[PDB]
Amino acid sequence: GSHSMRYFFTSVSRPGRGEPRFIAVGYVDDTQFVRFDSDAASQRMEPRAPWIEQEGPEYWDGETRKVKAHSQTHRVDLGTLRGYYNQSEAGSHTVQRMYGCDVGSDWRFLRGYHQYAYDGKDYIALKEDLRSWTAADMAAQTTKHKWEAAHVAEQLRAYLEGTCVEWLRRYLENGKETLQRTDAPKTHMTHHAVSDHEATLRCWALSFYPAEITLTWQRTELVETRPAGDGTFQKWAAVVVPQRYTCHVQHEGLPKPLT
Amino acid sequence: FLPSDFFPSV
Amino acid sequence: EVQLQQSGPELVKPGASVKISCKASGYTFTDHFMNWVRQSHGKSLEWIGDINPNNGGTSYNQKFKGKATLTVDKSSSTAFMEVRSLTSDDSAVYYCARRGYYGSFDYWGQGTTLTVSSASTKGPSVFPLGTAALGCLVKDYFPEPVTVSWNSGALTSGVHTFPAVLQSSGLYSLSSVVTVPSSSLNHKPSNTKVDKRVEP
Amino acid sequence: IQRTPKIQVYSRHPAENGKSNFLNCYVSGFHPSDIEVDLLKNGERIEKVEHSDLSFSKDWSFYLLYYTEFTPTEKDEYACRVNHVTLSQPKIVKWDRDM
Amino acid sequence: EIVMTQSPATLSLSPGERATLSCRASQGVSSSYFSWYQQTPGQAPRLLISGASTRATGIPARFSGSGSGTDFTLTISSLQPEDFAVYYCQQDYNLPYTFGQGTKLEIKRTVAAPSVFIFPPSDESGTASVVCLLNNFYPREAKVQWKVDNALQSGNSQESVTEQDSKDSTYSLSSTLTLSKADYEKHKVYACEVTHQGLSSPVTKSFNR
């Protein structure tokens, strides 16, 4: 099926308390495999999955140096954005960057993306054609001009379509026993009364990978797909009933939908 | 595999 | 070949404005941003701003914002910069530097010297001064430059034409000198040649 | 500019009295990222608590998972306490075996 | 603003030796947005190293760049007569794009005693000038003091130094004592004291009126 490799970056400026708190996490589909925390003791990129540990120390050296480069840029960014918006040097601010590359069933490059935020609001983002930028305000318009000058989109497009895809396939092979293997949801049902004549029937969905799943009652109170901690995910959907509308569990790990 | 440091400041 | 042909030097009184031309050739003019750098006499380089030729979009150095304005003409593949409200502190050499496709300034123009002064044009007052030292000291003149040979070019063994100094009167003054042993004993702004012989 | 966190308190495996389990507190949809989360057992604040790495969703809101090992004994209530800049008071949510 | 600092200001080496220039950035700069430039007095700057390591088109193999973060280094394998010029470092990584103060590479040679020479004011205005001169001297540091009636008169020496000799590597200095004909006729001693680092005794040369 389809596969995606993503990276999430967060830098929170702390007024007069040192370098900004930089935190980076890397995902293959719904499985995190790398981590970097500026306040950590190791000062290096760390694994979060057993299969990525097969990479030698040369891999971890490179990933550590350029995750620090990402923190180096986000630090200048926070000071630059403080000047763009004429904000005080005593306030705490946040930058968030996320990019990645998707492959299809043929494992060839499918879609790419890159989004950048400041204080939780959208700042600048890369279009689906990987050629132009979309600026939210006049400050981001300056960054768009700045990045257009050095043709950053072309360099980013080259990374998303080549290096990002090549290493996505490489991770999928090394972690084939966990990444390419699906985990079907173990479903059960509970029943509870709520009012004088009505009751609530909950359709549970426990321990499944990937997290993509749909749970509805058609011919419905449902919560966020939450992690269990063991790499699998959970979800439940309920409805108050006094069954023409049934619970249909649909998941990639199931050959046919369950009811 | 992180991309190289080709991004300048904002 | 990538060539950036800038416009010639300009002398302007304070408080006016001037626009410098920068003709580009030898490449796709819309694929590269164009920058403008200022270099004061004896000082370092200073980035003014950049122009996106495709749409006219500009970013400026904060100090020059309000002083310099950038425009571009894709038809004639030329970049312009307008410098208004000129003062003596604007007297410098200005370059147009093409931004590299991914960064840096790869190609630079030949530069355009901008001189800002209240003086219009003056003329020099040539005061002539086991080896010995001669002397053909030139006094106040304006503007630069002035070629100073020696004995119709037949003496170029010690010809130390010193760089001109700007005096407190807003005037330049240099002093050329050649070396001769004891055994041996044109200002274009004014069109005044001086064959002033020297003898004690 | 500030989003209040959504809290989910639940066990990893189906709860069973006497058997060991993991008590999870899933905090999501909050901004900024500074948040203080503590797990509670009969009001007692558990100290052997771990948390996942910081990450955000498509709407830039952060999410975190705080967990610990516990045994769902009877007559022992468990809850999760969350403190954020959007909350004037700390918010507590009791753990429900049916949730 | 990211400040770019180069050191030393002037670096005097011999032709054919290695040259290592430095550039310290006040803030962390990506190596992909760091550049080196060479500029000859009278000519426009030229790109040497782009991307803090990538040589520009046409740049000889003797040039090389390296460094990361806040430290960067330009390296010339063998100094050539063209390579003795001024070198700058910039960052095109954060607005405003900034440069360094620059560093001039001067050809090193043996010390030269300055052939001092005193020049009289011309016969042809109520204003004269004492034209002191140092002929062919190395290094640039040549303290020209002026003793008017045996008194140090600073702030009146209009100096001008020629470029380094393209054959002898020697400088020339024309220290002109700015004064008037009235002040010249009010004193008797008016000489220039040359304290060249290559001399063993400060010299003097003048006359009474």
Segment holding A4, helix H or strand E: strand A3-12
Please state which CATH class domain D1-99 belongs to: mainly beta
Method: X-ray
Structure token pair of residue D95: 């753990």
Touch between chain E and chain B (3+ CB pairs, < 8 Å)? yes
If asked whether residues C62 and C152 sit together in one domain, one would say no
CA–CA separation, A64 vs A35, rounded Å?
10
List the domain boundaries for chain D. 1-99
Which neighbouring-strand residues pair with A233? A208, A227
Other beta carbons less than 10 A from residue E107's beta carbon: 18
Residue of C nearest to E37 (CA): C105
Segment holding E128, helix H or strand E: none
Closest CA to C147 of C128, C136, C161, C127: C161
If asked whether residues C18 and C74 sit together in one domain, one would say yes
Q: Count contacts between B and E (CB, < 8 Å).
A: 16
At residue A13, the 3 state secondary structure works out as coil
Residue D8 to residue A226, Cβ atoms within 8 A: yes
Phi, psi of E112 (to 5 degrees): -130, 130
If asked whether residues C145 and C161 sit together in one domain, one would say yes
Contact list, D35 vs chain A (CB under 8 Å): none
**Count of the separate structural domains present in chain C:** 2
C139 at the A interface (CB within 8 A)? no
Task: Answer with the one of C100, C116, C132 that is the final residue of a domain.
Answer: C116
Helix axes A138-149, A57-84, angle to 10 degrees: 130
CATH number of A189-250: 2.60.40.10
**C139-172: burial string, b at 16+ Cβ within 10 Å, e else:** bebbbbebebbbeeeeeeebebbbebeeeeeebb
Domains present along chain E, CATH in parentheses = 4-107 (2.60.40.10), 117-196 (2.60.40.10)
Please state which CATH class domain A3-174 belongs to: alpha beta
Closest CA to D53 of D64, D61, D38, D62: D64
Structure token pair of residue E186: 């009010």
* Chain C interface mutation, best of A145, A146, A152, highest count of C Cβ atoms under 10 Å: A145
- By DSSP bridging, strand C92-99 and strand C34-40 are antiparallel
| Integer angstrom CA distances of residue C32 from A127, C35, E103 | 21, 10, 29
If asked whether residues C43 and C92 sit together in one domain, one would say yes
At residue E82, the 3 state secondary structure works out as helix
* Cα separation of the two ends of chain D: 30
If asked whether residues C98 and C10 sit together in one domain, one would say yes
| Exposure of E195 in the CB half-sphere (CA atoms within 13 A) | 5
The answer to whether A87 touches A98, Cβ cutoff 8 Å, is no
Resolution in A: 2.5
If asked whether residues C7 and C60 sit together in one domain, one would say yes
Which range marks the domain in which residue C87 is found? 3-116
A136 at the B interface (CB within 8 A)? no
- By DSSP bridging, strand E86-91 and strand E103-107 are antiparallel
B3 at the E interface (CB within 8 A)? no
Task: Answer with the one of C116, C136, C151 that is the final residue of a domain.
Answer: C116
CA–CA separation, C173 vs E48, rounded Å?
36
List all residues of chain D from 10 to 49 with a beta carbon under 8 Å from chain A: 10, 12, 14, 22, 24, 26, 28, 31-34
At residue D8, the 3 state secondary structure works out as strand
Task: Answer with the one of C99, C116, C133 that is the final residue of a domain.
Answer: C116
Q: Angle at the Cα of D55 (from D51 to D60), degrees rounded to 5? A: 140
If asked whether residues C76 and C164 sit together in one domain, one would say no
Give residue C174's identity as a one-letter amino acid code: L
A→E contacts (Cβ < 8 Å), by residue, are: 69, 72-73, 75-76, 80, 142, 146, 150
CA–CA separation, A24 vs B3, rounded Å?
13
Domain of C64, CATH number, reads 2.60.40.10
Contact list, A142 vs chain C (CB under 8 Å): 59
List the domain boundaries for chain A. 3-174, 189-250
Residue B1 to residue A147, Cβ atoms within 8 A: no
Touching partners of A (3+ C-beta pairs < 8 Å): B, C, D, E
If asked whether residues C90 and C186 sit together in one domain, one would say no
* Cα separation of the two ends of chain E: 56
Please list, in sequence order, all residues whose beta carbon lies within 8 angstroms of the beta carbon of residue C32, skipping any fewer than 6 positions away: C53, C98, C99, C100, C101
| Integer angstrom CA distances of residue C17 from C12, C14, C72, C82, C92 | 8, 9, 18, 7, 14
CA–CA separation, C55 vs C72, rounded Å?
9
Phi-psi domain of A231 (left: phi exceeds 0; alpha: psi -120 through 50; beta: other): left
Closest CA to D96 of D19, D23, D20, D6: D23
Q: Angle at the Cα of C94 (from C88 to C100), degrees rounded to 5? A: 150
- DSSP for A59-123 reads HHHHHHHHHHHHHHHHHHHHHHHHHHTT--TTS--EEEEEEEEEE-TTSSEEEEEEEEEETTEEE
Contact list, A140 vs chain B (CB under 8 Å): 10
